[PDB]
Amino acid sequence: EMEKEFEQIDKSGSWAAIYQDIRHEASDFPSRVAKLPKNKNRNRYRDVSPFDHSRIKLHQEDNDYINASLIKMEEAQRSYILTQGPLPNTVGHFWEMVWEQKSRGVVMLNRVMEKGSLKCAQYWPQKEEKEMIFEDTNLKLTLISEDIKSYYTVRQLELENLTTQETREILHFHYTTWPDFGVPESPASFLNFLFKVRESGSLSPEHGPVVVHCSAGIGRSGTFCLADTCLLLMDKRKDPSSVDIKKVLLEMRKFRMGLIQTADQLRFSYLAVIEGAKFIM
Numbered sequence: 001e002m003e004k005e006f007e008q009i010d011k012s013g014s015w016a017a018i019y020q021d022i023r024h025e026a027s028d029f030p031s032r033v034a035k036l037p038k039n040k041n042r043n044r045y046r047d048v049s050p051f052d053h054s055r056i057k058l059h060q061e062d063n064d065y066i067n068a069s070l071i072k073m074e075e076a077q078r079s080y081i082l083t084q085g086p087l088p089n090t091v092g093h094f095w096e097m098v099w100e101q102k103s104r105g106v107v108m109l110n111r112v113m114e115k116g117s118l119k120c121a122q123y124w125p126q127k128e129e130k131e132m133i134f135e136d137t138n139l140k141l142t143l144i145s146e147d148i149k150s151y152y153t154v155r156q157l158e159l160e161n162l163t164t165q166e167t168r169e170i171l172h173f174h175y176t177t178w179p180d181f182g183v184p185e186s187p188a189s190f191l192n193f194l195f196k197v198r199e200s201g202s203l204s205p206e207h208g209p210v211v212v213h214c215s216a217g218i219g220r221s222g223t224f225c226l227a228d229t230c231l232l233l234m235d236k237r238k239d240p241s242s243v244d245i246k247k248v249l250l251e252m253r254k255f256r257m258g259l260i261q262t263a264d265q266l267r268f269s270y271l272a273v274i275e276g277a278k279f280i281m
């Protein structure tokens, strides 16, 4: 049982050691499309690339590339798109991906500015009456409503395909209180946020995969889909304590490199799953 594994690693202070064994064991697949010179300005970080086998392709004949990966968790029946925070020049590609993949939710785990630098383009409207038009991808985005709470904001957005005049409602879930340095002290507000995204229907198989991002789409984004998948597997299995968080993380790392960036994020992921689990038992 992980609760005991948690105390063992914690009492021994072995988090940096566990984390290194995960780094060592992690899959390595080609990322040739990401490294093409015509795609250099489509990537926020030169060392964070989608694998070719799991990359999301845009349906535009010119350049199909976006820094985004499909994470398919077969046993949990959960899919996620993990992506980088859009760049000024990729905001249109981001919304094209949301449209083409039939996503119902976008989960954002960063602020636009952190540590005095821009982590992300402002890719949604700030006011009802000031909609955004993405000329390159022929999409219109309108803010419908905004509900600001202590730890997160939920926004209802309308995305319109200007080509076909179809419209869809997108839910934007913005976790606003992840600290600039390290991880939250308690997973309570993170778990409430998770169950809010679930209650929305955004993680359900009758929609396309949820889009999850932070700045790089690997660290906080990793913690989100690791906690969700682990908790779902505990519901599904005859023996809930058969769930090994290290094994689940390695399965997820087949689909996108570097998920969970620090030993602190790994410790936080264990805490989140343990607390969530105990919130059933």
Ligand SMILES: Cc1sc2ncnc(N(C)C)c2c1C
Binding pocket: 191, 192, 195, 275, 276, 277, 279, 280
């Ligand atoms: C950590 C949280 S928040 C939340 N909201 C509604 N239902 C829940 N259960 C019991 C599945 C939870 C859990 C386990």
